[PDB]
């Protein structure tokens, strides 16, 4: 945090850091191109969506109605098969939540990561995320407490904003 004022001004304050250029040319050649890269992702994404979850920290194992039915489209397992299918492919999982209610948001949408980029800002954590499809942006805001995007990263040792995505290692 004290080192936040020095890494963000060198990376560029208030701008979108795009990162990997071949994050989509590896998807169509390494996931729809060969069966081993196809099966290995679909093996894990169907497996991590199959393990159940328990609600601790409540002092007794019981939002479980949110995860089992996020939205009108994809089902509980369809949500995690798309979420883990982005972390294994591009190292970055994004989760939009719409909340007309003040707490416990209504829908969870897996924002796909290849059309998604961060902006660092002045200090520490990223200030916004830009969902850029076509030429059109969105500019979410993280300058508040509820923070409408969870950003799940895999481990990346040299970059400060993204994941490494084992498909990049086996390219």
């Amino acid at each position: 945090s004290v080192t936040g004022r020095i890494v963000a001004m060198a990376s560029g304050a208030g701008r979108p850091v795009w990162g990997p250029r071949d994050t989509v040319s590896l998807m169509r050649t390494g996931f729809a191109g060969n069966p081993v890269g196809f099966r290995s992702v679909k093996l894990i994404a169907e497996a991590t969506a199959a393990v159940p979850l328990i609600c601790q920290d409540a002092e007794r194992r019981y939002v479980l109605d949110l995860l089992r039915r996020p939205n009108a489209g994809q089902g509980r397992a369809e949500l995690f098969e798309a979420l883990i299918g982005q972390i294994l492919l591009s190292g970055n999982g994004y989760l939009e939540a719409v909340c007309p209610e003040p707490g416990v948001p209504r829908e969870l949408h897996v924002l796909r990561s290849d059309r998604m980029a961060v902006v660092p800002g002045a200090d520490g954590w990223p200030v916004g995320y830009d969902y850029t499809v076509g030429g059109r942006k969105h500019r979410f805001d993280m300058t508040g407490h509820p923070d409408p995007i969870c950003h799940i990263k895999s481990f990346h040792p040299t970059d400060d904003h993204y994941g490494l995505s084992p498909m990049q290692a086996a390219a």
Partner: protein, 48 residues
């Protein structure tokens, strides 16, 4: 006694302040190790 008195220097070597407006705030920067960078434009468009 003139040798006994010694002036006190500043804490840090200070310099002239120069402006930091660099057109890098409005232009588009990319992180490209490659010995160059290419861009692809459409100087004209299709016809309908």
């Amino acid at each position: 006694g003139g040798y006994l008195v010694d002036p006190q220097t500043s804490e840090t070597i200070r310099g002239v302040l120069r402006s930091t407006a660099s057109l890098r705030q409005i232009a588009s920067v990319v992180n490209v190790e490659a010995t160059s960078f290419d861009v692809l434009v459409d100087k004209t468009d299709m016809g309908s």
